[PDB]
Amino acid sequence: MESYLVDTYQGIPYTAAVQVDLIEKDLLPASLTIWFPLFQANTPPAVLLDQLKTLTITTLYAASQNGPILKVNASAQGAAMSVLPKKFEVNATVALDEYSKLEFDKLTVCEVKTVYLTTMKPYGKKTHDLIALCDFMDLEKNTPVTIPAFIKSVSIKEQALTQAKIAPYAGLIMIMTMNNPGAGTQVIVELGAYVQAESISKICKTWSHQGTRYVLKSR
Amino acid sequence: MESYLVDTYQGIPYTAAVQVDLIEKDLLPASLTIWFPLFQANTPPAVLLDQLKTLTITTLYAASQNGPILKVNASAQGAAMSVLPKKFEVNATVALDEYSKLEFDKLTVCEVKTVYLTTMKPYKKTHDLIALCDFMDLEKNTPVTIPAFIKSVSIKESESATVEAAIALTQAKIAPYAGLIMIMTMNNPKGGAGTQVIVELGAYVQAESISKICKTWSHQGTRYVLKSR
Ligand SMILES: [Ca+2]
Ligand SMILES: [Ca+2]
């Protein structure tokens, strides 16, 4: 019921990274940002997003061996929504004030306040590390920021222009696509979910990629 | 140089869970909360903390296959500090405003604002035994229930039950370790042995509030439930 698109890949089949800002339909509503397992899409992104705007999510707070989780169940209207992951578990790691607002074992329908789509390239002798230093400018604050991305590990015997974008996926992720040395290839750096759902939209629109420096570090 | 102790375990050898609130010593200082790999201690906790108050940490921002990390190197004064993990890597996951403050590949000494110590115990499926730990936020007067998975049990002639009985007391405490963790100890288990369950609450929190949460989140009680799978 409110969207934002980050288009890193424009292609016939592409990986879809979906993240949603939710709010519980109950008397102690918790606000949550969760993301879907990745899936493949063959329809235009602007068109997938519209269909995703009909998303209906149901969560249920549960315990698991690897900490507490949320058993998610989702639905949407549209042909392209047949491939949408319907039932998946997520780590119920929330802002500490939200823990009180998380009723255990109560199947609650959540209400989508924003739906984010990120397009990606479908997935399908040893020293020095090739690392890419992605340079950005926070236009809200006019303060630079450099996020390092590990690329390859090369061996040493005794790129010019690439694109980087801040996208909302595992909270926020930086995705960098290299054009040639190979070919179109993406590196994802996870920045973590520790952030206000409101600021997620803010960061993406204010963090402008300035340039990329490739460095080499002996191991 | 400030300290706080959470004594879940009191024993001859015990697991030490150390977490520190740091601030870089540079011209764009980043504030950081990192925790040490767990280690064993044989000296009193109040005594280990004193020695830990002499902690000197050096971080260096680096890239890794599993996102960006911080190459940590640490030292402290005192005999018990021989066992302290000296060189360890940590995930460099910070509050977003902090990313600008983190300088790539610049070896910076960090300054310890607070040292936290937490003591611990050294270490065909139908239903799940889950413990609902009940707490009260005294600052806000609002309850909070954190569910801990204990074990999977098998019931012959089984249904899909709820609340359970032994086979009544246990203690639970909110402690600063992987940011904040709830640690629950089963006194007279099935009523094996004294056994602890750690629930990770995540590092998503202001270093200041970490001290606040621990002092205000009081354990009210524990309900044992059963959930069919
Ligand atoms: Ca609720
Ligand atoms: Ca700095």
Numbering used by the authors:
A (entry chain A): 1 to 124, 138 to 171, 187 to 209, 217 to 254
B (entry chain C): 1 to 123, 138 to 181, 188 to 211, 217 to 254
Sentences from the paper on this structure:
The matrix protein (M) of paramyxoviruses plays a key role in determining virion morphology by directing viral assembly and budding. The matrix protein (M) is a major component of the virus, and is thought to form an ordered layer beneath the viral membrane (Battisti et al., 2012; Liljeroos et al., 2013). M plays a critical role in assembly and budding through interactions with multiple viral and cellular components such as nucleoprotein-RNA oligomers (N-RNA; Ghildyal et al., 2002), lipid membranes (McPhee et al., 2011), and cytoplasmic tails of the viral glycoproteins (Henderson et al., 2002). We show that HMPV M is a dimer, both in the crystal and in solution, and Ca2+ stabilizes the structure.
In this study, we solved the X-ray crystallographic structure of the M protein from HMPV at 2.8 Å resolution. The P31 crystallographic asymmetric unit contains flattened, diamond-shaped M dimers. The M dimer is stabilized by a large network of conserved hydrophobic interactions with a buried interface area of 1,421 Å2 per monomer. Each M subunit is composed of two similarly folded domains (NTD and C-terminal domain [CTD]), which are joined by a 14-residue linker (residues 123–137) for which no density is visible. Each domain consists of a twisted β sandwich, in which the β strands in the opposing β sheets are approximately orthogonal to each other, and a few short α helices. CTD loops (residues 180–188 and residues 208–218) are not visible in the electron density, most probably due to intrinsic disorder in these regions. A unique feature of HMPV M among all experimentally solved M proteins so far is the presence of a Ca2+ binding site located on the solvent-exposed surface of the NTD. The binding pocket adopts the classic Ca2+ pentagonal bipyramidal geometry, with an average coordinating distance of 2.4 Å between Ca2+ and interacting oxygens. Binding involves the side chain carboxyls of Glu24 and Asp26, the backbone carbonyl of Leu28 and Lys101, and two water molecules. Dimers pack crystallographically through a relatively large (624 Å2) NTD/NTD interface that is stabilized by polar interactions, propagating a helical arrangement within the crystal.
